[PDB]
Amino acid sequence: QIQHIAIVGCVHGKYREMYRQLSEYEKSTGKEISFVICTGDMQTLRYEADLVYLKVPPKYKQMGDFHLYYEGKEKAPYLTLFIGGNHESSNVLLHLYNGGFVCFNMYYLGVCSCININGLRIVGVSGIYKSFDEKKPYTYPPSPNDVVSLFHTRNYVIQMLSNLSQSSQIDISLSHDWPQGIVMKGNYKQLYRFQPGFKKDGASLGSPINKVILNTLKPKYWISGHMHCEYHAEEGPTHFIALGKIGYKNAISYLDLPLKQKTDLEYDKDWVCNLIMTWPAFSNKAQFPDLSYSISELLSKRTKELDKKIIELWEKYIGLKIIYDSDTFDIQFTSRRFYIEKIYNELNI
Ligand SMILES: Nc1nc2c(ncn2[C@@H]2O[C@H](COP(=O)(O)O)[C@@H](O)[C@H]2O)c(=O)[nH]1
Ligand SMILES: [Mn+2]
């Protein structure tokens, strides 16, 4: 029994084209797509106003396809999971920094998180790396002055994710830019022939943040977009797979994985516990996280019995199933934070 997972690189707002290719696959092969994974540049612009939050050169200030799906005119034929890249409606993604559905069948994993589906554990890390913004907090509500910095990956995600492989392995990890140095771990001479511009960066190509996370969790698969090319590499037990850009034939590939249990999309318990236990660092809605707190120190307080109570409370107020919520994203921001705070304060500390 096997499941077929579509892995997609850069979408850049070409949703109808993406879903067509996926459909062409299910007919070319007669195989069923279980769900879709996307590695960023989703450009989930709801309406014209969101263009302000899209960091692109002027000629790429375009609405794209997403609003069609936001409006219900079009409907995603598959459950689609994604992280953010460097070309996003960053205001929308900041509202949903704790993850959320942007529309039917399209789930954003947030700044970072781990989810559960079909017996698999999947980790996502949004954004691209810029050293000068790695320690920068998020400011809320979103502001047009931060269009150039909202999509930069923060250092703290490392401490947020580092313990996730303690109780079970990670099957798939997602990032937009490549883990730094992994370019040297495939046929890089061949890669440079197709992509001569990459040779200059050498082993420094990619995100040092994703490099750390990969080395720490050692997932079965690490999948990345950003670089506009197909590429495979092996870092120890980890299969690295880079994907291209929609419109070109290197953008989509497929994972054929053993299917033990068919199971709806669910929150990962270990992630949920980290989420609750780090609440003090995220308590200021105007500016988070406050790094006068040590994320590691906060997470060190997790215990078997506390985790059990947390998951019990999460199931009660939110549910383990990740379900579609059609409330505006500003409402979802406040709502999810309300329950995280409620649960933390119920533990007693
Ligand atoms: N040499 C080099 N090129 C990069 C690097 N990061 C991004 N690029 C180039 O910039 C493009 C970014 O595409 P976009 O993010 O606009 O979809 C990549 O496809 C790649 O050609 C990098 O670190 N080094
Ligand atoms: Mn990109």
Curated annotation (Swiss-Prot):
Gene3D superfamilies named among the record's database cross-references: 3.60.21.10
Region (Lariat recognition loop) residue spans: 126-154
Keywords: Cytoplasm, Hydrolase, Iron, Manganese, Metal-binding, mRNA processing, RNA-binding, Zinc
List of residues binding a divalent metal cation 2: D41, N86, H176, H226
Biological processes, Gene Ontology terms: mRNA splicing, via spliceosome; RNA splicing, via transesterification reactions
Regulation: Active in presence of diverse metals including Fe(2+), Zn(2+) and Mn(2+). Binds two metal cations in two adjacent alpha and beta metal-binding pockets. The activity is the highest with Fe(2+) bound to the 2 metal-binding sites. The activity is slightly lower with Fe(2+) bound to the beta site and Zn(2+) to the alpha site and decreases further when only Zn(2+) is bound. No activity with Mn(2+). However, another study showed activity with Mn(2+) bound to the beta site and Zn(2+) to the alpha site. Mn(2+) appears unable to bind to the alpha site.
GO cellular component, one term: nucleus
A molecular function GO annotation: manganese ion binding
Entry EC number(s): 3.1.4.-
Location of this chain's protein in the cell: Cytoplasm, Perinuclear region
Domain of life: Eukaryota
Keyword Lipoprotein: no
Binding site for RNA: K55, N86, H87, K130, H152, G197, D201, H226, M227, H228
Function: Cleaves the 2'-5' phosphodiester linkage at the branch point of excised lariat intron RNA and converts them into linear molecules that can be subsequently degraded, thereby facilitating ribonucleotide turnover.
Record-stated family: Belongs to the lariat debranching enzyme family.
PANTHER family named in the record: LARIAT DEBRANCHING ENZYME, RNA LARIAT DEBRANCHING ENZYME
Protein name per Swiss-Prot or TrEMBL: Lariat debranching enzyme
Classification lineage: Eukaryota, Amoebozoa, Evosea, Archamoebae, Mastigamoebida
Gene encoding the protein: DBR1
